[PDB]
Design a protein around this ligand. Structure first.
Ligand code: NA
Ligand code: NA
Lengths: 226, 232
């Protein structure tokens, strides 16, 4: 991701230093009155919410390089009260107050467009997941998440497409019903302490709009397993 | 609003004329290779995806003023195979090409921020919708849709917060028939939180919708506080 490398070099040349975080550690929480822009450079995180009765809901997942923003860029108020929790063993992220982001992007249109496109990618990803859901319910939801894991952390082997993601990260990342029936049906295989995908076509068949979204947004990655 | 009218005058000053569209017309279709930024100034539209077997899927509804885009601004490549259908009797929208938009935004950062924040609102909207869903299933989904309808087209009257929306648009949204949905709707009608009278919906217990769709209420507060304050 050359755009992300250029973005980090821009950040550092302007005195913003990388921070490291450990699993379960929060980059920002939902009660923070300071709005941020997190350039998640490396690792995996989850955007979660805490309801009034303390129930934790997992809303989204992100992997570096990506941009998460807790405030609006111009008004600098909150876009929504959330927590960004690290779920990989380690994570590297650049934390910026929203106003400093406004300045930095204001003096560079290239990286401004980069962050813009990260927003666009979120929006189109949401639309594709909603389409796949409207068509196939939770089967399509799970097929889409499995397809994303396949395209991202997938490696071909004589046994299938190994999802080379740490087993602990996989655990951290009705459901059981249809996934048991999926591996029942040989779409996935949980042999040798890891998931091997052996029916990519099935996944694509049931998450067609997310497959399209990945084809357009991550064409390089999409082209290796197709 | 103010920012929308400023963006409209900016577009016109840069030689971008508005365009009219009748109901069911397509502002753009999935096969058009040209990418666009669409500034829907007036009216209502819907973003559809057509599956292999022809099933038109309704993904999202947009109301003017708002901004839709079919291409990524950095790479100038498509964000997806979508259609933008007008569901209003009439709609006024500006059709800019993606590269022309890049030029126009690079020349004035206030409009750049306007569009940036539009996308931010859309992202956080999806997040809030999914949160309320994960919490309260279809009850929360329905309460949230009713809440956003009430904030947009709400009109305070002795009969509650009337939903100032055509019965045609209301049928397009389907409120007027899924089994599960009817079950929820009937309970709500019987409880006297929504009353369907005068061929139109009224809301008499906004607190119920706000309580069983909390994250969307929060979203409206944080991104549309002008509208949120009218009914609070
Ligand atoms: Na916060
Ligand atoms: Na397109």
């Amino acid at each position: 991701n050359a755009q992300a490398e250029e973005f980090k070099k821009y950040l550092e040349t302007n005195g913003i230093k990388p921070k490291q975080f450990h699993k379960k550690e929060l980059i920002f929480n939902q009660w923070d009155p300071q709005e941020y822009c997190i350039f998640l450079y490396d690792g995996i995180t989850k955007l979660t919410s805490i309801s009034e009765n303390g129930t934790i809901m997992n809303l989204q997942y992100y992997k570096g390089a990506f941009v998460i923003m807790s405030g609006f860029i111009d008004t600098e108020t909150s876009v929504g009260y959330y927590n960004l929790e690290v779920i990989s063993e380690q994570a590297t992220a650049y934390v910026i107050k929203i106003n400093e982001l406004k300045e930095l992007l204001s003096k560079n249109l290239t990286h401004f467009f980069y962050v813009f496109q990260t927003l666009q990618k979120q929006v189109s990803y949401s639309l594709a997941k909603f389409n796949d859901f409207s068509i196939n319910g939770k089967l399509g939801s799970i097929c889409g998440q499995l397809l994303i894991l396949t395209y991202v952390y997938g490696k071909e082997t004589p046994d299938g497409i190994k999802i080379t993601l740490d087993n602990l990260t996989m655990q951290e990342l009705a459901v059981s019903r249809i996934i048991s029936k999926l591996k029942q049906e040989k779409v996935i295989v949980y042999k040798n302490s890891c998931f091997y995908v052996q029916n990519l076509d099935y996944l694509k068949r049931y998450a067609p709009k997310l497959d399209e979204w990945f084809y357009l947004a991550c064409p390089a990655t999409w082209g290796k397993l197709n």
